[PDB]
Design a protein. Structure first.
Ligand SMILES: OC[C@H]1O[C@H](F)[C@H](O)[C@@H](O)[C@@H]1O
Ligand SMILES: [Ca+2]
Length: 769
């Protein structure tokens, strides 16, 4: 490997061999079908709300999130980079597709597939990823850096449906070598959203943009229809000319054929026919190819940028609503703008690289932090793009001031902005994209007094319940299968209108968003204040026994939605205490004296009774009335965790908090698989995992990262990082279960999982507060 010295990969990048088989991989541990796309994954490309494309460590474009809210795992084999090399003096050169695999059927059989093992590496530190190619049959070594401009405090470039592929080629040998790099792409119009005639009318054109000291050559792959539908738009691939490279292209090759129309040209001398052809297709799939060719002398290095863009302006959800995607603000809505997007990337990628380096640098340069922690911190952010992210710029047919936003909990539980989960998972938004965060919270504020008296069947017990109760915060803002932002509470496994955590978590999120953006945004507190008061007042009515604390009802009436709580729970009780203290403080900021006094009174009574009911001398009991009420819960002091972040001080005695955290580390971490897999949710005081429910026997990745954050604030530094390390290890390490770029909600002691691609582990960013 002589190419790594010519590029700048951070030591904390996650790494794997191209074509590496992984032997330890986990699978779903549930009864019903659950997504398992395998361990062949990579860091995604594409902006927030743009739709994303997962290019895996084997080189294939395989995890398709272009249909917003859906996960489709299938390798589009025509989408590749390929290389040609010929040493001066030899009769023939060699050509190779840079993909460690081959097609299942006979399409593209002429191409040279099966990139060999032990001949290259993949690296990822989101939003960047890299491939190096160090192959004994390729004398010139190559590397690519690929990325999308995902940039904190930037709501523009961060939305773009674009990827840059910055190639570096170096000749370590003593002979001249002719080199070509080719990007191929299928015209994917009709890949989704078209019920019949899926290729019909697709056509490709070549754009040559020649301006002094600029040449870009690009293929635009679109459809003859000017219809404005979810399926219609354009894809573009292209390259910017640099000194010493020549550009060639082929506008149209057949993807549903043997591929020799293209490959016979590329494999001969690395130079394509430059054949334009705008003839639309009928049944056949078609694609385009953009190539560069250059000669590298001994010791010479050259850099060349390619790019990919996709202009699919309309997202459609299953309930029938069509919305424009955020990036349309910047490029237009007509779906004929893929070249403009591509051109912007090709002309500005160096600036974008520097902007990404500027934001990563504070963390990467901190030599007190171990590299594994940096690997997790950056790569967990993949989910902000890959979580079915929806970000609207108007309803089709509709002009408002704000752009509504939603992140899925996951794809198996297809619910936007699940608030009980976002309590953990929204840290990167408040810390890095706070205008999005506040918009999402205003969305929730607006739902507080919505009433929908129509009834739904509760999944857990078959009983009927009201969809949405006035003054109760919703579980979610809908489903991609129905009507995001419009029809809330798509979730039906339990009735969220009786949950005891949602209203408190809402208030805690509001105050968090004020505190972590500098305690300056009084207008945000003013906007949300009525909803905060309503939320707490409604929750107070669920106190059955007049101890000043809402009573859990012997059912799963909170985020642990199969784990029953009864009476006063440590979890919901501590959240309530903290929410009361937050509301007191907002009351002071907004000069609402009567609110301050009321929530102060409620807080004092609740705090006294919480401590009396639950403090056992070593930790806080799980709750007051359940069968295993003395279980040690990993999340028992979630309210105190948030109180630390919100700078609300002690809600419980410092000494008791420290004892409880040490107990959790000693039991839930260290007695669960020797502390190498995170914190199990429930442990009995005899040191055996609590078996009352599956959720008690699970490690929750986002809960564990949050607990690590809590330990860190409380000065338990070793315990914090050891606790978090288990999650990193399981996710990323060779000794783990292969969950990179699909971190699940949960695993059991065998390492098998529930709900890959989950929002909650974004909570790792609470470790950076
Ligand atoms: O894993 C538990 C988790 O499962 C689903 F995502 C639910 O919608 C969430 O409310 C719940 O917290
Ligand atoms: Ca009570």
């Amino acid at each position: 490997d002589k190419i790594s010295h010519k590029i700048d990969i951070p030591d904390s990048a996650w790494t794997i061999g191209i074509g590496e088989k992984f032997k330890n991989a986990g699978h779903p541990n549930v009864k019903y079908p659950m997504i398992d796309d395998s361990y062949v994954q990579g860091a995604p490309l594409g902006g927030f709300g743009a739709g994303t494309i997962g290019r895996t460590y084997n080189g294939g474009f395989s995890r398709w999130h272009l249909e917003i809210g859906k996960n489709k795992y299938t390798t589009v084999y025509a989408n590749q980079f390929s290389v040609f090399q010929k040493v001066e003096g030899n009769k023939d050169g060699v050509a190779q597709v840079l993909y460690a695999g081959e097609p299942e059927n006979g399409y593209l059989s002429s191409w040279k597939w099966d990139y060999p093992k032990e001949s290259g590496m993949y690296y990822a530190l989101y939003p960047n990823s890299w491939y190096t190619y160090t192959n004994k049959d390729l004398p010139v070594q190559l590397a690519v850096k690929q990325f999308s401009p995902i940039i904190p405090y930037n709501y523009k470039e961060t939305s773009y449906p674009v990827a840059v592929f910055k190639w570096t080629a170096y000749n370590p040998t003593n002979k001249n070598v002719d080199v070509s790099i080719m990007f191929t792409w299928q015209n994917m119009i009709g890949f989704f959203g078209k019920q019949v005639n899926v290729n019909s009318g697709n056509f490709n054109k070549i754009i040559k943009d020649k301006s002094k000291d600029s040449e870009i050559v690009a293929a635009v792959m679109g459809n003859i229809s000017n219809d404005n539908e979810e399926w219609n738009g354009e894809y573009s691939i292209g390259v910017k000319k640099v000194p010493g490279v020549d550009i060639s292209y082929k506008a149209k090759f057949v993807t549903t054929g043997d591929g020799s129309d293209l490959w016979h040209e590329f494999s001969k001398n690395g130079i394509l026919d430059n054949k334009d052809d705008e003839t639309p297709t009928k049944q056949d799939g078609i694609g385009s190819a953009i190539a560069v060719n250059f000669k590298l002398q001994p010791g010479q290095t050259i850099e060349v940028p390619f790019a990919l863009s996709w202009d699919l302006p309309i997202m459609k959800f299953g309930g029938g609503d069509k919305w424009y995607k955020m990036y349309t603000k910047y490029f237009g809505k007509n779906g004929k703008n893929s070249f403009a997007i591509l051109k912007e990337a090709l002309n500005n990628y160096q600036k974008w690289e520097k902007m990404i380096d500027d934001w990563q640098k504070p963390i990467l340069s901190n030599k007190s932090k171990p590299d594994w922690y940096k690997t997790a911190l950056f790569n967990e952010l993949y989910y902000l793009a890959d979580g079915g992210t929806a970000w609207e710029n108007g309803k089709v047919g509709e002009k408002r001031t704000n752009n509504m936003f939603g992140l899925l909990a996951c794809f198996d539980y297809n619910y936007y902005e699940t608030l009980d989960v976002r309590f953990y998972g929204s840290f990167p938004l408040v810390m890095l994209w706070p205008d999005i965060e506040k918009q999402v919270m205003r969305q929730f504020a607006d739902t507080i007094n919505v009433q929908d008296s129509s009834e739904f069947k509760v999944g857990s017990n078959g009983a009927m319940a009201v969809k949405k109760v006035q003054g109760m915060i919703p579980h979610d803002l809908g489903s991609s299968y129905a009507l995001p932002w419009i029809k809330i509470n798509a979730y039906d496994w339990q009735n969220p209108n009786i949950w005891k955590d949602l209203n408190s978590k809402y208030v805690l999120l509001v105050y968090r968003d004020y505190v972590l953006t500098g305690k300056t945004d009084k207008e945000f507190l003013k906007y949300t204040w009525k909803s905060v008061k309503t939320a707490l007042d409604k929750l107070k009515e669920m106190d059955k026994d007049n101890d000043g604390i809402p009573d859990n009802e012997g059912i799963p009436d909170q985020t642990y939605d199969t784990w029953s709580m009864k009476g006063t729970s440590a979890y919901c009780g501590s959240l309530w205490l903290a929410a009361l203290k937050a509301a007191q403080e907002i009351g002071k900021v907004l000069k609402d004296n009567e609110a301050y006094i009321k929530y102060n009174e409620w807080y004092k009574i609740a705090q006294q009774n919480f401590e009396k009911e639950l403090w056992n001398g070593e930790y806080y009991n799980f709750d007051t009335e359940s069968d295993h009420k003395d279980s040690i819960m990993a999340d028992q002091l979630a309210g105190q965790w948030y109180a630390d972040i919100l700078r609300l001080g002690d809600i419980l005695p410092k000494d008791h908090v420290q004892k409880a955290l040490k107990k959790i580390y000693e039991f839930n971490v260290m007695k669960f698989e020797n502390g190498k897999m995170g914190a199990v949710n429930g442990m009995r005081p005899d040191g055996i995992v609590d078996e009352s429910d599956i959720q008690a026997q699970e490690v929750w990745t986002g809960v564990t990262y949050a607990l690590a954050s809590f330990m860190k604030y409380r000065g338990m530094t070793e315990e914090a990082y050891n606790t978090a390390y288990g999650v990193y290890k399981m996710t990323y390490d060779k000794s783990g279960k292969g969950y990179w770029f699909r971190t699940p909600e949960a695993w059991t002691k065998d390492g098998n999982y529930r709900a890959s691609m989950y929002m909650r582990p974004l909570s790792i960013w609470s470790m950076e507060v």
